[PDB]
Amino acid sequence: LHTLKLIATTMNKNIDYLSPKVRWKVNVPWEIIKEISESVHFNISDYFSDIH
């Protein structure tokens, strides 16, 4: 997933993955996560129900 640029991180140039100072983040939007959670049938709409 990190190779396919779906989860990603603070891109320092040639970062080490095995450090306790390199943190990760997703860079896919909501509109594909809803289709994914529809595919595996995971109720994710009620995970962000307490915000709007």
6 phi, psi to nearest 5 deg: -105, -50
Closest separation between CB of residue 51 and other proteins, Å?
Answer: 6
Task: Please name every residue paired with 26 in a beta bridge, in sequence order, or none if there are none.
Answer: 7
Q: What distance in Å separates the CA atoms of residue 15 and residue 47, rounded to the nearest whole number?
A: 32
Residue 44: which of DNA, other proteins, none does it interact with, CB under 5 to 8 A by kind? other proteins
Residue 19 interacts with DNA (CB under 7 A): yes or no:
no
Residue 21 interacts with DNA (CB under 7 A): yes or no:
yes
* Residues in contact with DNA by the rule CB under 7 A: 10-14, 21-23
